């Protein structure tokens, strides 16, 4: 179930994005509703450090690929 | 007095913008000096979280309405 | 002939926006009610000046301009716009939509004289969409 | 006539990407191999759908679009593009490159019918460059030190790997590798390189010199 | 037309180099096998990038450059090189041998277009000798 | 007619070299100042004899000879050198450049008589380049870390100093400074730079960003 | 003919910057004093190299580049720039402003030869504004 | 006296070279005998680490400047 | 036997060169194969100090006499 | 007519070199003694073959060649060399000095026939200087 996917405390972001995109594209949603759902799940899941990282984006991110690129650039190396 | 207006620690941004625009437009400034003053007061008042949010704007904001829209988009939901 | 909206209705709508907010369905219904007859740019501009605060009014001016620009792009993409005419001399500029054209600045009577009904309904729909955007943005 | 790529080769390439990763030179060689004949947008799209995960696939779609847009800018900057024609009626739109044009959406046969060979090779080169970008993006040289017990060839291997697989320009790798050999590589080898009667101006020469005169232990 | 080497053969050769080493006669035989047809600079460069580690790859780049320079000295010492031509306009520069010349950088198709068969066999023999040197040097 | 340089200016320049060193930008500016008018070999030779110590003077003689030899190679490679003439009888030998030719040894008046203005400016530029080489030679960036208690502007100053006063090419300093800001500069600032919503592509921009968002303490 | 600035004045200005700082009005007055005659890119570059530390010098190079780019945008926005000419062959590129053009790199004499007085005064004003920005930024 | 000059255990090489060249050029030797004496004093003074560094020179150094350059290149940083 | 000749730990280099050249010239090799063999025996015999001394030769030594001269110049006096 | 040196004197000189060494003043005096009459290349070559060991003999061949080359450079720098003649047909090549010219290889009689006395004294002085160099180099 896509709506139950959370980014674990120790999980990296690319694994979380892979799992989420997999569960959203392999589901019962229409094809035209996958990108907005993936974006809004990146924003509300993806534990509050990345949540604030996406929130304070000086540019407007309108695509899952752009969000992934931005987060991978500005992520907290740890 | 417009130059004494600060965004309180607990005040929202739309209330601060309303108060500031009110005090600037209902003052003794010429009509052609209100927009630059409102912008530069958004930048220097509006406590340092929003200050840094406006500073790191990938686009150049040249209007109080555009600054308000940008800040409302990327503000820290709390 | 131009007839202004009742200040009683405008006061009631302003208090509705003040208590219920911008996004409540009752507020949008009231706005749709006061957005029934095609309004002149003067009417909608003063209405939003009265019912909205300063910062929402700035946001609404921005959004209204953007929506009117989209309308004018669609108009130059189709010469059969109810605001346009058949010849090139009836093409509608943004100065005529925002009420900035010659013979219209500050004068609602002249505004009502030169404007087309298609112009009025396009301006009205644009203002309604801009209000929706700003309401979704403010809260 | 359109012929699909073998699912056996695609399965082997997918497992290669799964075990070796996106950035290994063997993986890039395999991709270059399966990128030999000019592919139709359908082929490359399905190939990247199968071999890449969901998030790398999104990144790759983005990068492919950007590279195709650069190609179309160069095409409108030169009417002699092998994808273009001489008249204005042969100008190639991005709907025709991404396979979105009329008579192409979802149909590989019609795609192969209307597309030009120059179009195919441009799409293919764009997809290869996008794959390179995403591979460099999906997965630090200045933090590499030679351990107290580590040999010198292992340290050199690790350092050259991290420097060549990084964001430096190609013309800045050799000087950085040399200056990292000189300042890292614990003070015995530091003094060994410092007191070199000859001037060493290449990482290979430094490696050879150090391997010759190293303290056998 | 350029055809790439099979990644299956390259993977098998890489594992051979990984288990047997660089200097075993079986490894040199396998390299001679995959060095049968004249390869373009792109092919040999990617092959050595994949089968060799980082430090042996640096050593091999050095040795390949030195051997190609010896070849170019012999070429300027004899205008009848199978890479050269009769006139001075066909003289082969190191940018054309290393694949750095115009129309070749990063493009294997254009590479295969402009290169001569004598150029290809000279590059291939140079790369083989450089591999032998590096293998004798690494262990 | 030959006029000597003021011993007062020479004494001030010698004390400048004594206190600031050979490589300070103020010292190079002062040398450029006293290198304004084209000097005769006698002038430059005595100047370097006075301002430089014995060992730097030996190094400078070597470097000056090498640079003059490069100049003479370029001169025999082009008969239109401002030191050369059109016929072969005006070709300039190194004895004429170093002041060793006939009628010049030890005599500055005869020197000024026979020398060309192009000869003088070539000698002067050669001497300046030789001084630069010796200064860079007479007196490590990859070992610089930001101390636990050190501020960021001090660390940036130290790092930029050590990177610009090193053996790197000019086109490799900015990327190295950036990548050293990112990997040095203890993990608080490392994470501050990592989580930059904008892409910082210049040391000045990185410094400005860090100074804005730094943890006041 | 190019004449260098006195190292005595430069030493005094450097010590002024060292004791008073970058932002004191006396320091800005001294800089305006040494910024009186139009300087060549070589002069200003060496001056800022000597008086400023490493990090302020990096900041100043950045700011100077940005201000020169604004100047070149204004120059392409007006063909009557005192640095420009009337025809298109006198358009001034940033390589000519920063001293990077052909015949100027490292040579102040050739620099002074090819540069225009309008070029010199524009470079000087740009450098002064950049110094002001960096001084306001450093402290 | 030039023939009594030794490189101290803690002294750098450029200071030793400066002192030696000073004492040799400011002495009673003929001008044509200074360079060979400076070279042979670099070789026999200049404590045995630099002595061995000069001894094992793959090239032949025939000038004090060349010896100084070589030693400065290959010296033991400490 | 020439291929069994090593430079002893205490032996000087001229004695080793004499012994090696004697054994190589008084052997069954062709006359055109003596110089390369003598050179390659200087390089691989002649205990690792002189081996490294010959290896790090800035010039290319292509004759036994030149190698002998170079080694005698730059040898470690002991 | 060529007369060989006494093997008794050569044996005594060889034992002198064996006991006293190459650099003793008595050894140099003895060499000067046996270097009194101008010797043919054959004589000096065999003398150095007998008195010197293998490695000093190689060094001496090198040094003798270098000194003879300096002599031939001075000879082409002055057409009045006692080895040269006035016309260009008497110019002395190194094959004639080292005894490698035609009619001289291995034959001392023909050597003595074609050689000039200036040639002989130049060869002798060159050999003496080469012996001095090698003696200073060996120990």
From Swiss-Prot, chains D, F:
The record marks 167, 179 as: Involved in capsid protein dimerization upon acidification. Residues 42-50, 103-114 are annotated as: Involved in capsid protein dimerization. It is found in: Virion. Coiled coil: none annotated. Self-associates to form the irregular polyhedron core composed of hexamers and pentamers, that encapsulates the genomic RNA-nucleocapsid complex. Assembles as a tube in vitro. Binds to inositol hexakisphosphate (IP6), which allows the assembly of the polyhedral capsid. Homodimer. Homomultimer. Homohexamer. This is Capsid protein p27, alternate cleaved 1. It comes from Rous sarcoma virus subgroup C (strain Prague) (RSV-Pr-C). The gene is gag. The chain holds residues 249 to 468 of 701 of the full protein.
């Amino acid at each position: 179930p896509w709506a139950d996917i959370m980014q674990g405390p120790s999980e990296s972001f690319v694994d979380f994005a892979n799992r989420l995109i997999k569960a959203v594209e392999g589901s019962d949603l229409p094809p035209s509703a996958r990108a907005p759902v993936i974006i809004d799940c990146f924003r509300q899941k993806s534990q509050p450090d990345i949540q604030q990282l996406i929130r304070t984006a000086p540019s407007t991110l309108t695509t899952p690929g752009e969000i992934i690129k931005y987060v991978l650039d500005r992520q907290k190396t740890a």
